[PDB]
Every structure is written in structure tokens, then in C-alpha cells.
Enzyme design. Structure first.
Site, PDB file in Angstrom:
ATOM      1  N   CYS B   1       0.812  -1.210   0.000  1.00 32.37           N
ATOM      2  CA  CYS B   1       0.000   0.000   0.000  1.00 32.37           C
ATOM      3  C   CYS B   1       0.848   1.264   0.000  1.00 32.37           C
ATOM      4  CB  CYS B   1      -0.922   0.001   1.210  1.00 32.37           C
ATOM      5  SG  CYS B   1      -1.539  -1.663   1.527  1.00 32.37           S
ATOM      6  N   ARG B   2       0.204   2.375  -0.338  1.00 33.86           N
ATOM      7  CA  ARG B   2       0.820   3.699  -0.297  1.00 33.86           C
ATOM      8  C   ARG B   2      -0.149   4.606   0.437  1.00 33.86           C
ATOM      9  NH1 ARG B   2       6.098   3.410  -1.575  1.00 33.86           N
ATOM     10  NH2 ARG B   2       5.490   2.224   0.286  1.00 33.86           N
ATOM     11  N   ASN B  40      -1.208  -0.780  -6.570  1.00 41.80           N
ATOM     12  CA  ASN B  40      -2.098  -0.686  -5.423  1.00 41.80           C
ATOM     13  C   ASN B  40      -3.524  -0.497  -5.912  1.00 41.80           C
ATOM     14  OD1 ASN B  40       0.122  -0.363  -3.164  1.00 41.80           O
ATOM     15  ND2 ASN B  40       0.660   1.065  -4.814  1.00 41.80           N
ATOM     16  N   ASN B 113       0.677   0.386   6.193  1.00 37.70           N
ATOM     17  CA  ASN B 113       1.358  -0.138   5.026  1.00 37.70           C
ATOM     18  C   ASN B 113       2.369  -1.183   5.478  1.00 37.70           C
ATOM     19  OD1 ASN B 113       2.935  -0.643   2.741  1.00 37.70           O
ATOM     20  ND2 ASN B 113       3.954   1.353   2.857  1.00 37.70           N
TER      21      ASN B 113
END
Lengths: 229, 227, 228, 229
Positions: B1-2, B40, B113
Site C-alpha cells: 500500500c501507499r 495498489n 502499510n
């Protein structure tokens, strides 16, 4: 379907759609004056004009009562001009966000509550969806909203079984038609609501007779007959 | 994830997430500093605090680039405090909106994340989802965010393979941890951005070292080692 | 987009789409021969013909790799004739299940990989969606699949920038075109695969040349040039 | 919620769920044996066992009547053992496919129709969702289905307001409990249906009284009481 529109001082989408005791949220599973469809669970949409006059829309293919994101965010979205709807899909019609009202040509937001044989409507390359309401919206936009009453009478003659309740807004005006389904008006001190059915039991709600046009601008509400035959 | 967070003068969700040339929208399909996953696309979320301090959230299980409603509405949503994320899901994990960051206990928004073995975490009845990040969020919330550093340091020792990058906000503060993944900071004249990666090539961006706690409030950015 | 079709002995949807090491599932996030789009995450569809010849379809607007229901159910769906696709949506096009291939007129299943100016296509009341591929599919169905070559050659003239890779099936026949994107064929002992790209490293795979029409019936593979 | 199960000769999902005049499809918008106003539009699921005994499931968070893919594909899915359900979501529970019945532990498919305070259930790391029914399913699976009747009686004593209708299957057996709602049974020449309510007006339908366990194998139906307070 059921729809609602607002023209006046700013109100939040939540205030108009979610919070009233018999509003659109409640109408998605328990409408009060709906003759066709038990509920309106086949998606929903909310359109509004921001302070720069830009039309913005949020639409979904899921039941309104289940949308936790809209429930959370709608109180933060305020506008002087709103058109929102909950959908009951005609059999065979795609259930998809692009088929949910409101439709738009960039200047107008538009919702259709009813039923129309697509076969009687002109072909178009400008519809947002293939479903009957979107084809009708395309026609209405093509003809211009100043011609709404004439367009609806024309379609009503082409399809004698059509129900053609329109609710439309451009940021400074509302337009609506009654043609086989319900519409009511509420005049508040800060603006005007038009709705398929009253979102509460306010005695101020007034029912619009069938086969009429409603035209709202600068707080004036004008109700006129449509042509039959 | 970001993920990305904002604390400062009001900023639209679109301005933070959709408009920058290398922001969260672009990172959903073409991230620049991601060592785990090529993309993502397993959902996204955007949380913000309105003018009365209420935490509000929009979450989805679909790819951020494909959401026409968010693209239309996000410009009209402005906040002094935002936390948003695009998700890359681990195999076996539910792909549903409740599993997308940010999670919330009503006061704090939180994005994780990384990766953590759920087996080392306590059972809970207070998680928003069954996915590992939600179980971790539940733990972090129950310990309190003022103990974020200690909680992450602890989980990091319980699971030496865990990656535990947290980004969190309560309307007036940001908290973040670096633990196995990237964090960068941008100090604007009108507020502070924290992000998994820079959303443009502003020379003001600077990277936070791994295994650190970041604390933002009253325009001060305080970075301390986790230990 | 990427698509795949099967005509032969009964084969499961999973066996064709999910199980191959570089099949449509893998192509949804890591295609090997795709010049347009990084991925195909904007939905998917699988169509097949049942033992009575009825066309049946499952379509989604979500990434194929994330669909737990399809992963669970696909092994139990077997057919002699399958058309499936993963979608990469052109900017401005609706991402919705009706916009995912395969399209259908009840007799044929059809997938389009490419791009075409909607302004050169006739208006129709028979399209399943507003996206360009659906308008093109409506035209193709209207003209009839036996005229596929004529239809694609015509549209390719009307829109010189169009990419017009079609893959279609009717239960006992496959049809396809190459027009600006990739296609390969695998002839197995028990049937024929047509695919945007090979789903494994089988030496049997051969690439179809651009600007050709492929006709599998059935028994026979024809690869004939289109008019340019 | 409403659920249905089949154990017998191969039957298509469509034939069980979509085709009957008052079956699960119809019960999603117009159930007959709940009060008017009630519906089951908050998702659905269909589980079945294939020839090799593998449990397979299709689940959604959308209304069953709206799913064109299921309508198209379901006639081609045939099984000797099926459990399917349409969901009505209770207060503040997530509406998401993982929260739709049937749940599974790889050997059993399980549906819960009712309501239980998660506060009386053990915490678990093995639930498929956060919703009360998923936590209950995790408990039931942990205790084993041969203990179903004791498990339900235990939970029922912990939560006197709990409704604990279970319908489960493992490919060669059905198990069910009545606990606050009723079940109905249809013995066909080729197999047995168990259902929250009859899917037609076949005179073979009989009702199972509250607070009982139902065990079906080889078309043999055995009904036993559950332990009381």
C-alpha cells in the site's frame, strides 16, 4: 424510483437525502406513495452544483441504505442546488452507476422516474447509459430544457403507457414534470424542495397534479398544465 | 500500500490525492518507491476531519483510478486534516471496503502499510475487518495513539518479519512510524504532508529514516528513533 | 484488454482462464505482449455455451485476480466453447459489467481488444453499453459474423487509427481478427485455443499475423488476410 | 435472512433458488413468512459441493434479484448438495460478500438466520467476517457440527433474545436448527429441501417446530428436540 431536488441557500446532501424521517434514504426500502416497485434498492445518485457552478455527481449501483461512505461524507457536501434519486430498475435494465440518476449534459442534472419504451425514442450517440431513462435524458437534453413540457407530451403520445416524471436542475432553476407518478413541493424560507413524495409530514407539502410542469426560479414556483393529445 | 496525510490549511482531497503528478492516484498503478507489489489496485480510502472535528471516510474495494464519483466529488471535499491510502492486498485477505485504510476509532484515522502475522496479535472483537491491518489497527487503538511508538516497537519484536508503517491523524496531529518501508515529509508554508512517497519533485521533500516515529503538531515535525 | 477462446472437448473455465501459468488471470496484472495499458484490471468476463447451446455469461467491473467467487466456482463450469476477457478501460469509458466483454446477441459471444472512434460508427438501439467496444459489437452483430471481415475492413478504413482485434464464438465456431494487436493459436489434440497471448510456453503456440481473419470450424483453422 | 438447502439427486442452483414462484429470489424482495416491509436485499450466497466433494461458493453484497451473472450462470451449476441464502443485515453490521452466508470451514457450508449479541460469543481468529453470524459460524465450526444442537442451546442460554436458525451441509448430510424462526421441509422423490419458507404451494411442505434439530441423510429426515432452559 424516487427523486428530490433543492434550490435555495446551501443545504447538505445528508440534510436533504439521509436525515429526514421519510426522506430518500427511508424511501429506498420503504417508500410511502410509490405505485410501481416495492422499493428503490437498485442504486442511487446525488448531484449538486459547487460554488463555481460546476455540476458534480456521486452515483452507485448499491442500495442507498447500505452505503457507509455516503452516510459518512454526505453531511460535508453542501450546495445551493441538488438533484438526488434512488432507483428501482425496470426489468432487463442494467444496474450500474451510469444508469443511476442524475444524468447530466454538464449544465443540467436530470432524473427520470417512470417507464418508457426505448423503441419509440430516437437513437442517440450522446447517452450516458443504454437504459431507457438515459436515452430519454439524452432526448430531453437535445431538445433543450425550455422545451421539457413539449418533449414529454410528445413522448407520452408516442408511448401511451409511458410514465415520464422528470426532475432537473441547472444551479439556478428547477424543472419537473408529472406524467403518471407523484410529485410534491415544499416552500421553505430558504428555498424550494421538489420531491416524488414528502420527506416528512410537514403540512406545507403541496401535491402537484398529474400532467403538469413545475418551474422554479428565484423563489417563484410556477405550475402549468401539459398538453394532452 | 501507499498512503498520504495532510495537516494544515484546508486542502481538497483531489488536490492531495488526484491532482499531483505522482500522487496517490498515480501510485495506484505506477508507484515510484514501492518494493512490495507493483501496484495498489485493491481499493482505496480517504478520511478527513470536517470543520467540527468529525472524522469522515470514503472507502472502496475498486481501483482508485476507476472511480468517477470520487474524481467528480473529491474537489468539493476540503479539510485541514486528511489521511488517504491505496491498497495492495496480500493473498487470502478480503478485498472489501472495510479492509481498506483508513481505519477509525472515531477520534483517530489510521493507515497501515506493511505486513504482520496475525498470530502474534491479540484476539479482538473490535476490528473493522478480519484482515491483518485491521487487527493491527484494533491493537493500536486499544493501546492509544500516544503509545504508538511503543506498540509498533513491541509488535516489531513479536514478529521480526513484520513491516509496520503507520500513518495516523486526529484532526490536530499526525503520527507516523517507519518500520520496513518508506516515508517522506514535505513542509509547506501552509502545512505538512507525510507520504509513502513524494507526490511530485518538490526539492522540499525529505525522507524519514527507517525505524522512526514522526510527530506533527503546531507545524512542528519531530522525528525520533523507535526504541 | 486480453482475451482467450476455446473450441473443443469440454474444458473448465478455471482450466482455461485461471490455471495456466501465464493465462488470463496472470494477464490481468502482468500481461506479456500488451502495448496499450499496463494491466487489465478494469473488469473481466467469461462466456460459454452449455450443453443445450445456450450462451451464458459472468461479467464484473472488478479485477479478475480479486474475485473469490469466480476462483471458487470456475472449476465447476465446463464447456466445449468459451470466450473470456480481462479489460483495460480507455480513459473516459464507463467501468461497469455491461462494458466488459463478452458481448452477446444470444447466438454469438464477442470480445473486442482495441480502440475505435465512436463517431464513425452508426447509431444503434441494440448496444449493451455506451463504450466504444459495445457500439462496435452491435455493428458487428447487425452485419452478421459471417461478414466480420468486411465489417472490420470497413471500420478500419473509416478510422485509420482504430485497433480492431475481435474474438468471437457461437458454440461450434471461433472467429477472430488481428488489426493492430496480438493473437496466437494453439492446436491441441482435443481442441483449439485462440488468445491475445499464449497462456504458457507450449511449443505449439503460433502467432497470427496482423490484418488477418481467423476462422476455426473445427476440424480446420483458416488464417486469411483482411483488406487493407 | 432466508435460506434454503438441497440434498438429493443433482439439481441446478437456478432450479432451487431462482425458478420457484416463491423461492429465494422472490424472498429477497417479497418473503411470505416475515412481516410486510421486510426484505433480504443485503447480499446473497450460494454454496454447493462438486462431484469430488469440494465446497464451492458464490457470494455477493448486492440484491439477488439484480444479479444478471448469477441469473445467467446458475442454470449450469448442478449439485447434489446446496446451501443458499439471501441476507438482511442487522444494525451496524458490514454489508460485504464475506459477511454473506454460506460460511465454510472447507468441509461444511453454513448459514445463520437470526441475531446474536457478539458480546456473549468467544473471541476468535478464525471468522470470515466481523459480523455476528460469522463469529457464530466460527464457534459452531470449532465445536464441530455433531455438537450443533448443544452449541446452539448454549448460545441460546447466554443470549435469551438470540435467534439461532442454522442450516448447514457437508455434501452428504444436512443439519439445521430452529431457534426463533421456523423451518420447512419438502420430501421430493429425488431428494430433500429444507427452507426458511416453502418456495411454492406443493402440498408436501411441512413445518418444523421451534427449538428442534433436523438431520437429513440419504433422504431420511430425523427431527429431535433441543435442550431447554
Amino acid at each position: 424510483c424516487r427523486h428530490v431536488a433543492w434550490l435555495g441557500a446551501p443545504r447538505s446532501l445528508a440534510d436533504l437525502v439521509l436525515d429526514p424521517p421519510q426522506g430518500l434514504l427511508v424511501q429506498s426500502y420503504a417508500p410511502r406513495r410509490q405505485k410501481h416497485g416495492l422499493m428503490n434498492a437498485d442504486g442511487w445518485g446525488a448531484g449538486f452544483f459547487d460554488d463555481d457552478g460546476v455540476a458534480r455527481r456521486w452515483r452507485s449501483d448499491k442500495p442507498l441504505w447500505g452505503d457507509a461512505s455516503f452516510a459518512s461524507v454526505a453531511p460535508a457536501l453542501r450546495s445551493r442546488c441538488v438533484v438526488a434519486a434512488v432507483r428501482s430498475a425496470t426489468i432487463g435494465m442494467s444496474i450500474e452507476p451510469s444508469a443511476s440518476a442524475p444524468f447530466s449534459d454538464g449544465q443540467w442534472l436530470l432524473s427520470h422516474n417512470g417507464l418508457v419504451a426505448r423503441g419509440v425514442l430516437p437513437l442517440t450517440g450522446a447517452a450516458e447509459s443504454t437504459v431507457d431513462s438515459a436515452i430519454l435524458a439524452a432526448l430531453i437534453f437535445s431538445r433543450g430544457l425550455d422545451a421539457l413540457g413539449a418533449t414529454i407530451a410528445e413522448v407520452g403520445e408516442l408511448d401511451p403507457n409511458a410514465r415520464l416524471n422528470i426532475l432537473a436542475a441547472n444551479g439556478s432553476r428547477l424543472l419537473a414534470t408529472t406524467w403518471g407518478d407523484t410529485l410534491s413541493v415544499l416552500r421553505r424560507p430558504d428555498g424550494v424542495v421538489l420531491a416524488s413524495e414528502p420527506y416528512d409530514d410537514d403540512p406545507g407539502w403541496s401535491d402537484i397534479p398529474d400532467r403538469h410542469l413545475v418551474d422554479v426560479r428565484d423563489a417563484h414556483v410556477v405550475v402549468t398544465p401539459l398538453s394532452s393529445h
